[PDB]
Design a protein around this ligand. Structure first.
Ligand SMILES: C[C@H]1[C@H](C)CC[C@]2(C(=O)O)CC[C@]3(C)C(=CC[C@@H]4[C@@]5(C)C[C@@H](O)[C@H](O)[C@@](C)(CO)[C@@H]5CC[C@]43C)[C@H]12
Ligand SMILES: C[C@H]1[C@H](C)CC[C@]2(C(=O)O)CC[C@]3(C)C(=CC[C@@H]4[C@@]5(C)C[C@@H](O)[C@H](O)[C@@](C)(CO)[C@@H]5CC[C@]43C)[C@H]12
Lengths: 813, 813
């Protein structure tokens, strides 16, 4: 149908149809008489997977011959989503498969809906890992993603009586056609035991062994025939495990629980032992694999060359144990002296920080590490001692600096600060947006920055234009390609060329037409899947992201109620109709986040069934927000809500997805919003609220929520409604916690941004009344979204941290 | 190479080679540079599996169109062994694959050694199930095997310091290419809950749900293009399971433990709850599947026709809950009246008894069934009440009969007698050999036989000539085929024709040549795999079977020691050299069986390193006895030890394997030994010891072991050696338990058969000195082994129990 989806040429279509039928028959053991859409999905998935393997094998062949520097991206989360359409796109197979499936009497889009999300992440951090893998393959880097194959990913969210229910995400039930089990490359991981000292140094003995089994998933580059590997470790009991007899066999489960389930916490630390085991598990298996690969190369005994052959990137502090683990292997097993092992470690490792929120920082109780990893604690103490000697020598007499910079935190319970560990043992530390990187240098890591200024960098986050434009928004990609060609897909800066079309009447019409189609499709999705009715002519006001206080879903809630109260005051006045959509998961133990979800639904219960309101205001909670739901709602959005308190959202990536897909952004000067507004021009953005400086000023003076309550009658009315049970008639005091928090213990100053936010929202409504000017502003956003491609981000990592050159060159097919 | 292995015709060899390479590349994602033999095995296994699916699909198609009566074989054990060679044989692919793999530079035999045994059974009962499935497919029956897919089968046995160590049989580690997961056909199984009574009868409520997921494995008939199904159920937690959050996800393991591990007890009952859950699990899932298939047929609401469309065979009492479960479904769910449901149940079910040993009988505590299956206990009480009313009416006033026949056993703990349940609810009850079936009618089920004589039958066990001749002994199958053709493979009675070759000098030479080759190959296997040295010219004296007291491995031990002591007394006298091989697993908690294994190795420690003995006597314990080890040692055997106390071994099947493969049999008149001797003639068998009558006489008088000790000096010497630490110098009293048991509490009267056994063993040695007469006796055995084909057994089940006609007719290819 459309150009950007590739050629559907007779020879390919015929070959695809016959391999489809081969897989249906031989692989699935079905025929057309019994086959369900699921069977049809699998036959297609197997047919497409076949196209990868040749490229996969020769890519890995190429790296063996050329022996380039290898990039190892260590993350506990890879939020991949669906793989079918992404593979077709990157392989140029999408039209051919559409044709082949059409001719077999099947709708490919219906088949795509059957694939489970690989939901092995929580949100931003996990999805960044996924975008990174795509870009690394697209840029020809010899890169590997290493993580854990969780049996259960992020929970499926069900709304019941307005409340979140969690159910297990059993994503492997029907199988995963993309992975290849590699039991032959299984590796032992050690836990517990004790440390023995000898003439030949320390020995870690009497350990419990857990086996790590790798599963490989292909990662295709965009149209370059590069297929990299994501290797995920699964936990297996050894066969002499416990070995009355029955119980010993049943207790094998204990070892295998390590890889059972993803911890569902977004930006929040929980000091649980199982979590620490997961962290060491991925680190120990990966490092052995890295070293084995280093030794078995065309180059090489000599660990001097290690940093020239290996880069290890730590996605947050979750794989921070890679630092003492690498030291352990180099010192205890390879017999290098401390100072040489340490130079190698620092030159190999690099650390990316994702948040400044104190409750998100990993600080592990010493007594946990003592029991679980006795050798690693010793190495940590020794790293600390030598590091503190460097601080003492640089800042003599500064005793408070010493306690501030220590990796060991003193208190009732002694803790290891994992972020401090990462800084000390990495040659590079980066934040994920310019303002976030500055905040690190000025506040939380100020001391470390004064010691080693050269270590600190910025790498502003990015999103992949393949998944986040071509895949999810084919209509928009097509109208862009008509004017400027296809090269922008792997060089997103080229979208600037679209600025010379901002006054083009045909393009304006097309941009606005694609948005309307997207909105109509999504409104249909809501009716068919969730039996909910929305007006596709209203402004689609969308806030989708994890439910957190700092993300201020509550600020949005306050606006929504203001609009309702204004309508009820002046019913016969014209207002721009809105559909307000809020979506996101709450961590299971996060009580406040669960309350906010209930409020949102409770608001919808009042607003959606008020006859006076009509179709002018709708409030919808988007259930089970995840990657494949994002691919649908983002192209359909008019307004992107990015309203975190200034200085709390390190970067955001949702913000970029919306910019790329033709929504306008209302937001604070937080995270990457600042860089986005800078790229588009502040006139093309709806910026409101306190800057970082204003927050600090308010903190010094003290934040008093009562002040705003007293001076803003519209705010008072809302609080009285919440308190008196207007939104919960059966349980009048249901929302006492929310009101209490807002009035007395609001860390995120919801009320302080209320007035500016509401006023700015009026300016949004005003612009929406003039479709031509709205669309021209939209075009100005899309055209300047180029910088926020993860290809740019990854090229910066490659050049400034890893010391490798990106390549756009094809491998032979 | 050999005729019986099929054609290696240019077109087939070329097609096999290319599909091998296709699977290596696309399925395994390997190439010739990295591939190991394991990779080569899998590529072959996938290539062969491809040949099944077409036949598999059209067989199931055929049954849908014709709608024949369906046979359901319910067993908790299917001891399948390896599948590759068996599939090639039954498909006529063996020479073609040998050729194709040869031309790729691979040795197929080396590749076959890589396949894990599917060891989902303990011994006789489990292996009978496997032979039955082969024969049912070979005879064109619409038959299904239903069981449990254990994650861990029978443990691997390691010998350490002479002692058995058990390790987990992780047979699925590298995957199973034969099975096809069918998650779409998952079924709920209910546990616990309570019974509620209404107007519309009883309701089972508040149950815990466990999901049963089926895995299908193809079962090919011999050269007839019939491919039946073995369906094995795997336990899965439902997704709302328990649903703090983490723990709820981890506790999903509890539900899934149901299918985790096979209970390693051969002929012994253990009243564990997990075992009862397994039993109900397979029964509930299978019955739902049977009923669903019955309703969705070309025939049919009307359960009158159920017994015309369905036969359910119960392999022992392990699936006995099928009886109250079928009643439950018919009465509670389908709303049939009791009497009609009961008529349908009895006409549907049939029961096969496998042992008379009291400790093997399943007698479940009422309090277990009360908690786990409250509705089934009620149905059991009601079945019992109505059954006891029938007994009272037939034998008025006979109050002791009533208590004897009751399904409910009274005592400290009330128990359900599952065998009694099976007899009451089945139209047919059979033993597994003629003497065993008589013992049932005369002793343990005498009361039931007097009530319903028409219910009691014999079906003498059989073994499959495909696995147990063609597959494991190609050399012998070939020399037989040269004389009489190939038709005997699916009609084993034709082996009688070989009687006219008993005086043929060429045939005698060939039979003896094949045995020598078999012995040389096995002696080489022992050196290569276990670094043990045997003389291939000695008589191979072999006892392989589960380690049990009733099987009397100890009697064998006593002979072995007698031979040693005689040699040491008269060193320079000629004796026929023997290699005595004993093999078998002991149940982990069976202390005595573990002691016997230690004795056997302890004997070998003394005998094998006595220079005076030389190569005249060797005692070897065969480690990890299992199906694939049987396929190797059985063709290599000269003497088959079948020496159970008369009346204890219900049938035996090992005995038949040895007869078919050219060993002579020394044994008691026990089980099927009686029928074997009858077929060959007693002159061609080494029969010794008490008959059943003699045992009974000895029991009445009382068995006094001291009597034999006093009157047999050779026996006394052995006991003194055991007591004084001759066979355990470091631990002189190591064998006190064995001596004590022999002297004071021997249920199996080892000493009573000692003299006759030793004397008979001398007659065996005498015959072995004359190779020509030994071989002529061998030929007389092989030629009369026809009756012991499971094709015969299965045809008898089909005609006399199930009411279906066997067919040798091909399906179109
Ligand atoms: C040496 C092993 C090690 C035992 C485990 C880690 C290893 C790795 O580097 O990831 C596993 C994979 C192989 C076997 C490895 C190395 C090379 C091959 C290779 C590229 C070799 C090549 O000749 C084959 O054609 C091809 C291209 C194809 O078989 C292979 C692909 C597989 C690798 C990369 C590694
Ligand atoms: C009705 C279902 C039920 C939902 C679950 C149990 C069932 C069974 O009888 O075992 C599952 C298998 C199918 C779907 C079943 C029935 C028929 C098919 C069938 C023989 C149908 C035939 O047209 C196909 O060509 C073929 C021959 C091929 O698709 C099928 C094969 C599969 C069966 C036998 C059963």
């Amino acid at each position: 149908q459309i150009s950007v989806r590739g050629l559907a040429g007779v020879e390919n279509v015929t070959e695809l149809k016959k391999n489809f039928n081969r897989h249906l028959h031989f692989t699935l053991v079905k025929d057309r008489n019994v086959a369900t859409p699921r069977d049809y999905y699998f036959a297609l998935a197997h047919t497409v997977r076949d196209h990868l393997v040749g490229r996969w094998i020769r890519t890995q062949q190429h790296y063996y011959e050329k022996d380039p520097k290898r990039i190892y991206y260590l993350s506990l989360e890879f939020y991949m989503g669906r793989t079918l359409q992404n593979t077709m796109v990157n392989l140029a197979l999408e039209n051919a498969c559409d044709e082949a499936t059409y001719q077999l009497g099947l709708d490919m889009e219906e088949l795509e809906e059957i694939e489970e999300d690989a939901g092995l992440g929580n949100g931003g951090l996990g999805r960044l890992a996924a975008c990174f893998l795509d870009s690394m393959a697209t840029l020809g880097l010899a890169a590997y993603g290493y993580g854990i194959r969780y049996e259960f990913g992020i929970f499926n969210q069900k709304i019941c009586g307005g409340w979140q229910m969690e159910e297990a995400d059993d994503w492997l039930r029907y199988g995963n056609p993309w992975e290849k089990a590699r039991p032959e490359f299984t590796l032992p991981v050690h836990f517990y035991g004790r440390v023995e000292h000898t003439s030949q140094g320390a020995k870690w003995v009497d350990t419990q062994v857990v086996l790590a089994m790798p599963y490989d998933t292909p990662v295709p580059g965009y149209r370059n025939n590069v297929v990299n590997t994501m290797r995920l470790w699964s936990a297996k009991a050894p066969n002499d495990f416990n070995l009355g007899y029955i119980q010993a066999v049943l207790d094998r489960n204990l070892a295998e629980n390590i890889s059972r389930v993803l911890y569902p916490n977004d930006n929040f630390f929980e000091g649980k032992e199982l979590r620490l085991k997961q962290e060491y598990f991925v680190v120990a298996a990966t490092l052995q694999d890295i070293i084995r690969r280093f030794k078995s190369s065309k180059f090489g005994t000599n660990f001097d060359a290690f940093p020239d052959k290996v880069a290890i990137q730590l996605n947050d502090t979750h794989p921070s144990l890679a630092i003492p683990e690498l030291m352990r292997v180099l010192v205890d097993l390879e017999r290098l002296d401390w100072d040489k092992a340490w130079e190698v470690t620092v030159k190999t490792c690099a650390y990316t920080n994702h948040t400044v929120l104190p409750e998100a920082l990993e600080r592990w109780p010493v007594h946990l590490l003592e029991t679980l990893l006795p050798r690693h604690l010793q190495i940590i103490y020794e790293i600390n001692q030598r590091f503190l000697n460097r601080v003492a020598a640089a800042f003599p007499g500064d005793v408070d600096r010493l306690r501030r910079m220590s990796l060991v935190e003193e208190g009732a319970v002694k803790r290891i600060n994992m972020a401090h560990l990462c800084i000390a043992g990495s040659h590079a530390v980066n934040g994920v947006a310019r303002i976030h990187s500055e905040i690190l240098k000025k506040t939380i890591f100020k001391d470390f920055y004064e010691l080693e200024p050269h270590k600190f960098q910025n790498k502003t986050n990015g999103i992949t234009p393949r998944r986040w434009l071509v895949l999810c928004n084919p209509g928009l990609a097509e109208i862009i390609a008509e004017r400027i060609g296809e090269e922008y897909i792997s060089d997103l800066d080229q979208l600037r060329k679209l600025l010379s079309y901002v006054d083009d009447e045909a393009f304006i019409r097309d941009v606005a037409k694609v948005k309307q189609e997207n909105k109509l499709k999504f409104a249909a999705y809501l009716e068919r899947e969730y039996k909910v009715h929305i007006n596709p002519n209203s402004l689609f006001d969308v806030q989708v992201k994890r439910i957190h206080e700092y993300k201020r879903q509550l600020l949005n809630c306050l606006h929504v109620i203001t609009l309702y109260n204004r309508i009820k005051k002046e019913p016969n006045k014209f207002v721009v109709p809105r559909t307000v959509m809020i979506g996101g998961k709450a961590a299971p133990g996060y009580h406040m986040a669960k309350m906010i979800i209930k409020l949102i639904t409770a608001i919808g219960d009042v607003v959606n069934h008020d006859p006076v309101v009509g179709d002018r205001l709708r409030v919808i909670f988007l259930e089970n927000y995840r990657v494949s739901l994002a691919e649908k709602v983002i192209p359909a959005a008019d307004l992107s809500e990015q309203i975190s308190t200034a200085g709390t959202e390190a970067s955001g990536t949702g913000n970029m997805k919306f910019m790329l897909n033709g929504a306008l952004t209302i937001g604070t000067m937080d995270g990457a919003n600042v860089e986005m507004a800078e790229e588009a021009g502040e006139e093309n953005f709806f910026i409101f609220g306190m800057r970082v400086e204003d927050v600090d000023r308010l903190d010094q003076r003290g934040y008093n929520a009562q002040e705003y309550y007293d001076r803003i009658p519209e705010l008072r009315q809302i609080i009285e409604q919440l308190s008196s049970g207007f939104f919960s008639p059966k349980q009048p005091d249901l929302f006492k916690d929310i009101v209490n928090m807002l009035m007395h213990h609001d860390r995120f100053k919801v009320f302080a941004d209320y007035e500016e936010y509401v006023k700015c929202q009026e300016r949004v409504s005003a612009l929406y009344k003039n479709p031509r000017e709205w669309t021209r502003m939209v075009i100005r956003n899309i055209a300047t979204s180029g910088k926020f491609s993860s290809d740019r981000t990854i090229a910066q990592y490659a050049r400034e941290i890893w010391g490798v050159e990106p390549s756009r060159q094809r491998l032979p097919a």
